[PDB]
Amino acid sequence: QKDAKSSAYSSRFQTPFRRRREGKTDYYQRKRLVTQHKAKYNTPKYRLVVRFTNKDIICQIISSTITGDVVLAAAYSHELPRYGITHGLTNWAAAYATGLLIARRTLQKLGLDETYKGVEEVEGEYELTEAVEDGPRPFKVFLDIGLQRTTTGARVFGALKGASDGGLYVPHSENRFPGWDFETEEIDPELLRSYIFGGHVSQYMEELADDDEERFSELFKGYLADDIDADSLEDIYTSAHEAIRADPAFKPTEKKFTKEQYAAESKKYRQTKLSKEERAARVAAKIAALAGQQ
Amino acid sequence: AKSKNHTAHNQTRKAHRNGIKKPKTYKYPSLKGVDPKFRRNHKHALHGTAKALAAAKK
Amino acid sequence: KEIVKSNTSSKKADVPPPSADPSKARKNRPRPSG
Amino acid sequence: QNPMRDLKIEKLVLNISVGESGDRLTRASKVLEQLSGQTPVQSKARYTVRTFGIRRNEKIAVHVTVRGPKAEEILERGLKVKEYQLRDRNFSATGNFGFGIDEHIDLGIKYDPSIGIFGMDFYVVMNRPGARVTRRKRCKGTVGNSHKTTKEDTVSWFKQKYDADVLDK
Amino acid sequence: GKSHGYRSRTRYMFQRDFRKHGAVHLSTYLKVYKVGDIVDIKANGSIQKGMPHKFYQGKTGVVYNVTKSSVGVIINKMVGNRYLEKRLNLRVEHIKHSKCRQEFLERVKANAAKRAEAKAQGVAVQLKRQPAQPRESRIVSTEGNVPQTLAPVPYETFI
Amino acid sequence: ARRPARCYRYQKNKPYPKSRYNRAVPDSKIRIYDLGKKKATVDEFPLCVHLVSNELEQLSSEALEAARICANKYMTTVSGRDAFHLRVRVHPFHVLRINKMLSCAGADRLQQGMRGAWGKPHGLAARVDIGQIIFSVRTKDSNKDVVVEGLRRARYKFPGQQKIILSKKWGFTNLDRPEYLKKREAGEVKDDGAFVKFLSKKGSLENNIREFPEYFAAQ
RNA sequence: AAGCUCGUAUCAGUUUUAUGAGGUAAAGCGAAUGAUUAGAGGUUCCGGGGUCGACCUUGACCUAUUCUCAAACUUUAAAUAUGUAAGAAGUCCUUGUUACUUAAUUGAACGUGGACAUUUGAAUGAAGAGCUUUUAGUGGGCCAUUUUUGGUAAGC
RNA sequence: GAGAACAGAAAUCUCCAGUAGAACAAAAGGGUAAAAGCCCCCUUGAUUUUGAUUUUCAGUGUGAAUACAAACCAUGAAAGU
RNA sequence: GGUUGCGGCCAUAUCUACCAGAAAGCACCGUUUCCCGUCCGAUCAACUGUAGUUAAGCUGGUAAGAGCCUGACCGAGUAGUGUAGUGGGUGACCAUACGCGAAACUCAGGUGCUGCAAUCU
Numbered sequence A: 001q002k003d004a005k006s007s008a009y010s011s012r013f014q015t016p017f018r019r020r021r022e023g024k025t026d027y028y029q030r031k032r033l034v035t036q037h038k039a040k041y042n043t044p045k046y047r048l049v050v051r052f053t054n055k056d057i058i059c060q061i062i063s064s065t066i067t068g069d070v071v072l073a074a075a076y077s078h079e080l081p082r083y084g085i086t087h088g089l090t091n092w093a094a095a096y097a098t099g100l101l102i103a104r105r106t107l108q109k110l111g112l113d114e115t116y117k118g119v120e121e122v123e124g125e126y127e128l129t130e131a132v133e134d135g136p137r138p139f140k141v142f143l144d145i146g147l148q149r150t151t152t153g154a155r156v157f158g159a160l161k162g163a164s165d166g167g168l169y170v171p172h173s174e175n176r177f178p179g180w181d182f183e184t185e186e187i188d189p190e191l192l193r194s195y196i197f198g199g200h201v202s203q204y205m206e207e208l209a210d211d212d213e214e215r216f217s218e219l220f221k222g223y224l225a226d227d228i229d230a231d232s233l234e235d236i237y238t239s240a241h242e243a244i245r246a247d248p249a250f251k252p253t254e255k256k257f258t259k260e261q262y263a264a265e266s267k268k269y270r271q272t273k274l275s276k277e278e279r280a281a282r283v284a285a286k287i288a289a290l291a292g293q294q
Numbered sequence B: 001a002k003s004k005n006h007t008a009h010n011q012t013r014k015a016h017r018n019g020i021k022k023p024k025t026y027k028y029p030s031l032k033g034v035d036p037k038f039r040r041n042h043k044h045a046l047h048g049t050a051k052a053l054a055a056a057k058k
Numbered sequence C: 001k002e003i004v005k006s007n008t009s010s011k012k013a014d015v016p017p018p019s020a021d022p023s024k025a026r027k028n029r030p031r032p033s034g
Numbered sequence D: 001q002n003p004m005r006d007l008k009i010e011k012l013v014l015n016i017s018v019g020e021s022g023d024r025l026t027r028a029s030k031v032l033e034q035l036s037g038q039t040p041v042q043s044k045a046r047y048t049v050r051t052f053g054i055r056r057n058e059k060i061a062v063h064v065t066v067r068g069p070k071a072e073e074i075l076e077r078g079l080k081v082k083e084y085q086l087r088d089r090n091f092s093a094t095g096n097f098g099f100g101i102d103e104h105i106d107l108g109i110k111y112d113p114s115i116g117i118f119g120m121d122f123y124v125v126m127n128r129p130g131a132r133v134t135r136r137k138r139c140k141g142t143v144g145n146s147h148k149t150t151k152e153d154t155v156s157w158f159k160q161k162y163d164a165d166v167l168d169k
Numbered sequence E: 001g002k003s004h005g006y007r008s009r010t011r012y013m014f015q016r017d018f019r020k021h022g023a024v025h026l027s028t029y030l031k032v033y034k035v036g037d038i039v040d041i042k043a044n045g046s047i048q049k050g051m052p053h054k055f056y057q058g059k060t061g062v063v064y065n066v067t068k069s070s071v072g073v074i075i076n077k078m079v080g081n082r083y084l085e086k087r088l089n090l091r092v093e094h095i096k097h098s099k100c101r102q103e104f105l106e107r108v109k110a111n112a113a114k115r116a117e118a119k120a121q122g123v124a125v126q127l128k129r130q131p132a133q134p135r136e137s138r139i140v141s142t143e144g145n146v147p148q149t150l151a152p153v154p155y156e157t158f159i
Numbered sequence F: 001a002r003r004p005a006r007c008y009r010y011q012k013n014k015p016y017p018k019s020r021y022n023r024a025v026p027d028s029k030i031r032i033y034d035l036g037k038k039k040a041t042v043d044e045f046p047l048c049v050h051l052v053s054n055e056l057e058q059l060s061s062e063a064l065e066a067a068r069i070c071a072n073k074y075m076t077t078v079s080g081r082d083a084f085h086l087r088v089r090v091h092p093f094h095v096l097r098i099n100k101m102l103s104c105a106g107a108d109r110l111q112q113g114m115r116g117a118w119g120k121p122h123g124l125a126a127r128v129d130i131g132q133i134i135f136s137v138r139t140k141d142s143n144k145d146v147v148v149e150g151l152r153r154a155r156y157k158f159p160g161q162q163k164i165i166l167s168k169k170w171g172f173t174n175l176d177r178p179e180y181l182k183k184r185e186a187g188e189v190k191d192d193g194a195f196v197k198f199l200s201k202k203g204s205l206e207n208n209i210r211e212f213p214e215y216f217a218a219q
Numbered sequence G: 001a002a003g004c005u006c007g008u009a010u011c012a013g014u015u016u017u018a019u020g021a022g023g024u025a026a027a028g029c030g031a032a033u034g035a036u037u038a039g040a041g042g043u044u045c046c047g048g049g050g051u052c053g054a055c056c057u058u059g060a061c062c063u064a065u066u067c068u069c070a071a072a073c074u075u076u077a078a079a080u081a082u083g084u085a086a087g088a089a090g091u092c093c094u095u096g097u098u099a100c101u102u103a104a105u106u107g108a109a110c111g112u113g114g115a116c117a118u119u120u121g122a123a124u125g126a127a128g129a130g131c132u133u134u135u136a137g138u139g140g141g142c143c144a145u146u147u148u149u150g151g152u153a154a155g156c
Numbered sequence H: 001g002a003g004a005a006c007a008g009a010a011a012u013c014u015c016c017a018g019u020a021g022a023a024c025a026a027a028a029g030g031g032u033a034a035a036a037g038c039c040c041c042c043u044u045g046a047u048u049u050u051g052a053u054u055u056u057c058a059g060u061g062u063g064a065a066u067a068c069a070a071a072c073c074a075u076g077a078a079a080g081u
Numbered sequence I: 001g002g003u004u005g006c007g008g009c010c011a012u013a014u015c016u017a018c019c020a021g022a023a024a025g026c027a028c029c030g031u032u033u034c035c036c037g038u039c040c041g042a043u044c045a046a047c048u049g050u051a052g053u054u055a056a057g058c059u060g061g062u063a064a065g066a067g068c069c070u071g072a073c074c075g076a077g078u079a080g081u082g083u084a085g086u087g088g089g090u091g092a093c094c095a096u097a098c099g100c101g102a103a104a105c106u107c108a109g110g111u112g113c114u115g116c117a118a119u120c121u
């Protein structure tokens, strides 16, 4: 730019933590989650990591280790088709889905699945998973927003209300869900229970069916050729509920070929580094070209 | 009138006659300044592990 | 509706910044003659 | 060669710099709502200048930001006013550009003498796809060397379409 | 007037290192301290709360308490002729984990494993350390290295 | 006034420069550190002579001044006005203090005194290490006799011992004259203002090419 | 001064090894800051005037160089001095207590029962180690080498 | 730095650059960049109780400070503070 | 091996330029009813994955590149410094003895390593 930086600048510049430069981590907040009580010693702290890619929803149960962070067990939106949703991968009801998947998935890993049931048939009303009298206590997990901007009725808090509703202790307040009115100041479980099962996406299809066919042609084009209807949506997620709680156990992809086999090909497209004899020979040649005062 | 102000002269000397001692430590140090609800619960952990030997010996 | 947009400046001085003064001015400009 | 990098208009801010408080400011604020239909935002005074009769923190100017469809025609409205001829300045070296015209009557906008008379500033910023790379929250990046709208590149865009002209040199 | 307040003279001392500033990383918060731990004390300027007085900078002591954000450390300072017992309540950003004792454990443990070698064989133990020694007789080969003989250099000015 | 140079001759105090915490100090009686022909090309003035301190002490600007003036006025008027480049190699940054008991009429005081002794700035001097060069002169090799005496004539304004040293080096640079000329055939010397720039091997290959063409005539 | 409890328990104006901490000396300024001599290159086509019905000076900035500096500058950084450890109050195995703590027989302390001595876990020294009570005088100090402030300096 | 009616050195608007070269009452030094800065939202932990610890130190007082306990509150989705 | 979610150390990871990028992922991007946030669906929100795309973000390579990391009887046993003498010198200073010992310089090499999870010719 002819803003070119003086060596004095680039010599004294202090480079941030790498995961700041690439902007994947707010460490100010990470300190305020990871760090545990010192009279609680080595008993780790667990965060619920909720990350939305464009095409996927990531939900991970994570504790921290100085070698690197640990994840108990993880789920995805892209797992949900196995539980019966081909379309609508990233949306609130799919966040409740993935959130309730990892709720009954991880909590099963602990042997805590049977005891500490959940909220069962879902009124969408505000409650948390309380404690069993003379028994274990809920496995405590904390919400990790990541870089995500907090708003009332945000895609992340579905995974919150999904996972909280699946037996996990993930404390919160209702007010950032849909149905908290910023005057009323209490919650309406309808607007939530609607959203929980997809009661927005479906309602748009109806209204959109009226206004524009050509808009409905593409936007929902996946629902058309798959034989899916408007209020069928309510039972797509209500079914996957039973399906999730049925088989929370994690089966991975069988991933055709293998580890070694991938690598043999999967990057032949990276360049090799030179040696010093290579770079020095080029330099001496790059002189010969540019030489002769040209 | 004016006179001396300060010095450390000869003080190392005086403090090495009888001096410099040592922390004089014991086993089972005092608990001064330890978390109260540790030293509270710690009482009953010992109050209870007493009866355990008020039974075993018979 | 009066909506004001806030300044990101940390400067709380009422002093005009020393980019401005009788100097740095110019004897030129289209002073209207008509 | 040039699949995704074509162009667009990022935003156009019409700015009306009053220089005084009260009516002339508050009236010029109605002008910009009758202009874009968007409700505008006034600016406080940076610092006191007793020559211009304004204490600091005195509400002075006003403007509004418009994008997409509504801007391009209000931009097209202005290009009719200066008659599709612009100078070698008016185009920033960062690729963006802008001009100004008096009276605001010249593009639509009937009189309404119960408003009064105002001119304005037309400045408009050019961008490309992948612009939110810089403007987002997560993983904020920086537009590469290619892309990165240049001065002669948004000129060859503004001369080709709009069939306009460079001037003054 | 003389000025003796708490942090006086600490200017360079409490400075963060050249090109190390801002937030403190997570290894500091992720460390566990129980009683008896031997810790080195070095203050951190970024954290003002619960930091040592400038005296204890560089001193090493045994933690006598573990609280929410801090550990009490008992340290021995001399006043007059004696050492009194100081105990500081310091946060974890100002606490290191002392490598002084750490090797002694790796010494004892290696000593017990070399004891089993005198149990399974019966050779002499040689457990306790011995300082460096006079070395020994040797023979230096003139083969391929023949002493090259030097003299002193004269005086000449280099500027 | 100017109490004699015998009072300030030795470096008795930590350097006390003109600064923010010390202001209102006089100006160095020597403002001119470079004179003669200061634009002369490097290759023009091969031979160099130094005036080197043999002592660890303080040189006052006023003394530096008269030394400078002395050297020049002889050097020029004998050999030539442009026959040399004289550089004063030391800058008087140390600020001397006086107490100044003398105040105003009619009487001195009793008995205070030493009380409030700290001084106001008096003069400037340049604190000098053993073997530190004071003056440097570069000229043509044929001027030696005239240059060697020029500095020799200026020592008498300098407190302490100082030697006149024949510099084995080219001009005001490094590189003893053969090791200079060695890099002159390779054209590694680009004349700068009254100095040279040297061609590195350390930089970007583009500008290294443009900068020193005849070095790769080729390589 | 009086002793008292004990008999090599524990030490130590010292080193060795392991492990900390520090920002002085030195050093650095074509590294930040602040100061500081000299030319050379490049835009203002000028901040301002001229030469002419746009070319030269003046400055202002900019680029790579050049001479010299800092108790209250500094990337770097000693020597000397300095905190800690070198065991039986050790290193481990097991599993009882609690109202603290945990998703939890998770922990945390504190115990029960059990594994290992022979260089028992650097050198050197120990004229013995620990403890207590009481009470005199003193509370103008000065000198040498070295580091060091004020002062031209002083048997200051 | 490059760009816009009057608008000029100085008004308001834009983009690019920008390791802190700004700001944090004040002395100075330290510390801070998705903040400790600017701005907005909500509050009264500038509260109750009573001990311990650091500096100064005689290891008295006083001033100031640190880490807890026991309550009762604020804030936030929360962990937290 | 690439790729992503959370990372540890926090430039061998930063800057500047220029190229290369299959698979998958990431993005860029389409959408403006609903929760939601703005002067402005730009950022924030929600819907869709459908209409389009590697141009960019991103990952690599290239540079007698900047900076940064590393090494050495490179400079230097130099500067400084601990101990010593009824050593030298009018002094300023300096030598020697028993030890400790730099920074600049220079040559040389290097340009992220890696944890848990998932995923892909």
Ligand SMILES: NC[C@@H]1O[C@H](O[C@H]2[C@@H](O)[C@H](O[C@@H]3[C@@H](O)[C@H](N)C[C@H](N)[C@H]3O[C@H]3O[C@H](CO)[C@@H](O)[C@H](O)[C@H]3N)O[C@@H]2CO)[C@H](N)[C@@H](O)[C@@H]1O
Pocket: F108, F109, F110, F111
């Ligand atoms: N060179 C002589 C120096 O002066 C010393 O003595 C000085 C003074 O003590 C003595 O008295 C002088 C007096 O002679 C002279 N004519 C008048 C002067 N006021 C006096 O001095 C007196 O007054 C001065 C100033 O107020 C003060 O120093 C003090 O009150 C007192 N000494 O005379 C000397 C100066 O005039 C000693 N003679 C000698 O040891 C010293 O080296």
Ligand SMILES: NC[C@@H]1O[C@H](O[C@H]2[C@@H](O)[C@H](O[C@@H]3[C@@H](O)[C@H](N)C[C@H](N)[C@H]3O[C@H]3O[C@H](CO)[C@@H](O)[C@H](O)[C@H]3N)O[C@@H]2CO)[C@H](N)[C@@H](O)[C@@H]1O
Pocket: G012, G015
């Ligand atoms: N020679 C090694 C070096 O010198 C030291 O190592 C050791 C000794 O040289 C050093 O001795 C020092 C002495 O210099 C100086 N007198 C300070 C200190 N009191 C002594 O150290 C010892 O002091 C007494 C016993 O004398 C003990 O109470 C104390 O705990 C101990 N550290 O004690 C160190 C530990 O025993 C430094 N730790 C370090 O520079 C380095 O290790």
Ligand SMILES: NC[C@@H]1O[C@H](O[C@H]2[C@@H](O)[C@H](O[C@@H]3[C@@H](O)[C@H](N)C[C@H](N)[C@H]3O[C@H]3O[C@H](CO)[C@@H](O)[C@H](O)[C@H]3N)O[C@@H]2CO)[C@H](N)[C@@H](O)[C@@H]1O
Pocket: A011, G031, G075, I070, I071
């Ligand atoms: N750090 C490793 C060591 O670096 C040493 O080298 C040191 C110097 O040679 C090197 O100096 C380089 C210089 O070589 C190069 N040609 C220019 C560069 N600006 C300098 O850099 C250095 O000095 C500047 C100030 O001049 C500082 O701003 C900078 O932080 C510093 N790294 O800085 C190094 C220290 O950072 C030795 N090569 C060797 O002992 C070892 O490799």
Ligand SMILES: NC[C@@H]1O[C@H](O[C@H]2[C@@H](O)[C@H](O[C@@H]3[C@@H](O)[C@H](N)C[C@H](N)[C@H]3O[C@H]3O[C@H](CO)[C@@H](O)[C@H](O)[C@H]3N)O[C@@H]2CO)[C@H](N)[C@@H](O)[C@@H]1O
Pocket: G029, G033, G034
């Ligand atoms: N001599 C040229 C003129 O003098 C001054 O500038 C001179 C210097 O101040 C400046 O020197 C360098 C500069 O080259 C470089 N690119 C940046 C650097 N910070 C400057 O540093 C300067 O100032 C700092 C304190 O801030 C000093 O420590 C340093 O010794 C001094 N050279 O470059 C000039 C030549 O050395 C005026 N600022 C300006 O009018 C003009 O450059």
Ligand SMILES: NC[C@@H]1O[C@H](O[C@H]2[C@@H](O)[C@H](O[C@@H]3[C@@H](O)[C@H](N)C[C@H](N)[C@H]3O[C@H]3O[C@H](CO)[C@@H](O)[C@H](O)[C@H]3N)O[C@@H]2CO)[C@H](N)[C@@H](O)[C@@H]1O
Pocket: G088
């Ligand atoms: N370095 C080893 C030391 O062993 C010591 O151990 C010593 C004592 O603890 C132990 O004493 C025991 C005692 O515990 C127990 N309650 C009573 C029993 N009679 C004592 O026994 C001892 O003393 C008696 C009486 O004089 C002697 O007859 C007998 O020989 C001796 N073993 O006897 C040991 C001496 O022989 C300490 N644990 C400690 O100082 C250190 O670890």
Ligand SMILES: NC[C@@H]1O[C@H](O[C@H]2[C@@H](O)[C@H](O[C@@H]3[C@@H](O)[C@H](N)C[C@H](N)[C@H]3O[C@H]3O[C@H](CO)[C@@H](O)[C@H](O)[C@H]3N)O[C@@H]2CO)[C@H](N)[C@@H](O)[C@@H]1O
Pocket: G095, G096, G105, G106, G107
């Ligand atoms: N809180 C009640 C107490 O619990 C104690 O047990 C708790 C711990 O103390 C006990 O841990 C023991 C520990 O006591 C003992 N001193 C050392 C042993 N390695 C530990 O074992 C621990 O680690 C091993 C793997 O290393 C695990 O398999 C095991 O589950 C775990 N408890 O395991 C329990 C939970 O961690 C004892 N049963 C007893 O002192 C008492 O009942």
Ligand SMILES: NC[C@@H]1O[C@H](O[C@H]2[C@@H](O)[C@H](O[C@@H]3[C@@H](O)[C@H](N)C[C@H](N)[C@H]3O[C@H]3O[C@H](CO)[C@@H](O)[C@H](O)[C@H]3N)O[C@@H]2CO)[C@H](N)[C@@H](O)[C@@H]1O
Pocket: F010, I093, I094
């Ligand atoms: N101004 C007169 C005097 O100057 C002296 O200055 C001396 C100091 O500045 C410096 O002396 C240093 C000393 O500071 C440091 N602590 C120890 C070091 N060995 C000495 O070194 C000096 O003296 C020794 C003596 O044999 C010489 O061998 C050595 O070459 C010389 N540099 O060098 C000077 C002596 O050579 C003293 N400051 C003091 O006696 C008095 O002020």
Ligand SMILES: [Mg+2]
Pocket: A026, A029
């Ligand atoms: Mg946050």
Ligand SMILES: [Mg+2]
Pocket: none
């Ligand atoms: Mg239980």
Ligand SMILES: [Mg+2]
Pocket: A173
């Ligand atoms: Mg609340």
Ligand SMILES: [Mg+2]
Pocket: none
């Ligand atoms: Mg509440």
Ligand SMILES: [Mg+2]
Pocket: B001, B002
């Ligand atoms: Mg008196």
Ligand SMILES: [Mg+2]
Pocket: none
């Ligand atoms: Mg006296």
Ligand SMILES: [Mg+2]
Pocket: B003, B004, B005
């Ligand atoms: Mg007295």
Ligand SMILES: [Mg+2]
Pocket: B005
């Ligand atoms: Mg006094």
Ligand SMILES: [Mg+2]
Pocket: B018
């Ligand atoms: Mg006694």
